[PDB]
Amino acid sequence: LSAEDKAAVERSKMIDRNLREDGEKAAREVKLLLLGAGESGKSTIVKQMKIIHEAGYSEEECKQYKAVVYSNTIQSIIAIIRAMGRLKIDFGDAARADDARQLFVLAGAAEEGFMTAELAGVIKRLWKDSGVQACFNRSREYQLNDSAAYYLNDLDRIAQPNYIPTQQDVLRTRVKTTGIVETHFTFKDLHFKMFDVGGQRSERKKWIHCFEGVTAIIFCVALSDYDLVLAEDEEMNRMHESMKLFDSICNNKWFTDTSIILFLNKKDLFEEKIKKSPLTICYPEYAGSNTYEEAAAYIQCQFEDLNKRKDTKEIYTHFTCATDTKNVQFVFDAVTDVIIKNNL
């Protein structure tokens, strides 16, 4: 009672000061939660924020993706070849059959990225083949990686002995993470906090409320999934599952005061796909013209329509190509502004 035990009370006071200052710093930062199905682009937007608003990637960090690049590469070629079996597609040149076997021989189990002169040639022979190409064109009929062609077309560069992933290579890589991914950056005078709970494959129900009160959500959508299914339910359309998700997220009680920002991503892939495939596949009752403008607009209207508090909340749609830094740079800037004009 009243003496030297007061030495701790001043430390207690010191601690509070730190809490205070920090808590103040914590009250003027922008928190963005990325959401949306797998493969929608969340991860890329995250990496974009690091190339645009922060250090980008140093030769050091870059060489540390060299394996994933090779892995993705191999993973991609294998999936296509396998895809030829299910689709009953031949090789343009029969000698490829041997290469296919060697692909699997060399490409051992999941160690890491191998990349040898022998394996490089093999993959190059396969990718170049007309049947493989014929199959690649039907990537809508099976699960296929989006950066397949990206890496495969650049096999010569990638395969090089002294190769080093470029920031693009890094951006195009898709690594499966299970923990929450987070990134910070300062931009336009404010500090930012962006998180991706993509790989957090668990019961959403348990942790969702942890984000109640985020500044805003950026919900990504893969426009090109309109003609894709789910290799598990078969009948379930991917574009539909995303909408269900959106409906859930959009009208979610925890997000009642949060700004919603749809990123209708993969517009570049959609632009090419819509020529070939009718939106009618995804939306049977679609009587519009099968053109980018009308089709893209239809989809936009479908998701925004899900919003039930239409008079209470506003959906800030933006069309993107997450792999384009310039495009991401610009859109984010419009996002940032809407954000301040809307809130702060």
């Binding site: 035990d5 701790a8 009370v9 430390r11 207690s12 601690i15 509070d16 730190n18 809490l19 808590g23 914590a26 299970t178 923990g179 929450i180 987070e182 709970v197 957090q200 494959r201 668990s202 019961e203 348990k206 942790w207 942890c210």
Partner: protein, 339 residues
């Protein structure tokens, strides 16, 4: 062929466990208690309020000394409080604020936490060099860390959203044992008194018994109509209580291998976030979604009262080893000590 022996063998194996239980069901905990003098209704008042967390608090844990306690809030800080002087002994800067759990080591030497980062961070409170930085990051889980409990400075168990619990060697940061078995996110785990074994509540609406040394599931308890977020051992170690989304708390007996009682009441439909027993085990304390902590007669199954003093939900409970006081954590960022 041979696949049938196994299948058939399995099918019947369940029945016997079932029937065996049915067999032992000669009476009810309630009937045999019906005559006891009821606790009546005793009251509690807040003796302390710990202020210092900004965000919601998701977990707290009393130190074996019954005075100090940790608390994890998603404000990125573990604050180690002095429940007596209310002094902040520590504020640990988390490398990831998505903390869902915190544990205080029996020796008051360490403290642990983790969450959406899927890691169990061990903090050595004795950094003679000065203050604290992470000592060990126990990584292996592929789902959020829902709970963790040190056995002793050398070992700690963790439950995870990836449906498993595990035993780790702190000294080396390696994973000792993988307790597979639950088919749903493991929300809570409870260390038996002798730290010999533990139980875990999950989203598959089942609790389980595990042999720490043997690393396998002994018994499996069912009955909850929804997820289980809290699990707690009856002081003697031959029973335990579980908290659930189905708005109920339940007492299960180990030796009898089944549920003895359900603690429910109409006009109470929110989920339970935390459970705890009084020093004697007569009272069962459950932290509720509706900002309150409800107190029940662990033997009689009625409401002995309720602790109201929170503005957001009660997310975590805590009874001192000396049974002297109760602690409550809340989404409202405050912690209270009740007597």
């Amino acid at each position: 062929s041979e696949l049938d022996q196994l299948r058939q063998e399995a099918e019947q194996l369940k029945n016997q466990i079932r029937d065996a239980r049915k067999a032992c069901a000669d009476a009810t905990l309630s009937q045999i208690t019906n005559n006891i003098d009821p606790v009546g209704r005793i009251q509690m008042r807040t003796r302390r309020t710990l202020r210092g967390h900004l965000a919601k608090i998701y977990a707290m844990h009393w130190g074996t000394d019954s005075r100090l306690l940790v608390s994890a809030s998603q404000d990125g800080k573990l604050i180690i409080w002095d429940s007596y002087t209310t002094n902040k002994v520590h504020a640990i800067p988390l490398r990831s604020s998505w903390v869902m759990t915190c544990a205080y080591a029996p020796s008051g030497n360490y403290v642990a936490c983790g969450g959406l980062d899927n890691i169990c961070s061990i903090y050595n409170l004795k950094t003679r060099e000065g203050n604290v930085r992470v000592s060990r990051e126990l990584a292996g889980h592929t789902g959020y860390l829902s709970c963790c409990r040190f056995l002793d400075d050398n070992q700690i168990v963790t439950s995870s959203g990836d449906t498993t619990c595990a035993l780790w060697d702190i000294e080396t940061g390696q994973q000792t044992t993988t307790f597979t078995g639950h088919t749903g996110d493991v929300m809570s785990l409870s260390l038996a008194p002798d730290t010999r074994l533990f139980v875990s509540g999950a989203c598959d609406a089942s609790a389980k018994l595990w042999d720490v040394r043997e690393g396998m599931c002994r018994q499996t308890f069912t009955g909850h109509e929804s997820d289980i977020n809290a699990i707690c051992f009856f002081p003697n170690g031959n029973a335990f209580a579980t908290g659930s989304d189905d708005a109920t708390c339940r007492l299960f007996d180990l030796r009898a291998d089944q549920e003895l009682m359900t603690y429910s009441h109409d006009n109470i439909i929110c989920g339970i976030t935390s459970v705890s027993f009084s020093k004697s085990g007569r009272l069962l304390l459950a932290g509720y979604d509706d900002f309150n902590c409800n107190v029940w007669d662990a033997l009689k199954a009625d409401r002995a009262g309720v602790l109201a003093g929170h503005d957001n939900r009660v997310s975590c409970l805590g009874v001192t080893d000396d049974g002297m006081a109760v602690a409550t954590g809340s989404w409202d960022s405050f912690l209270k000590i009740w007597n």
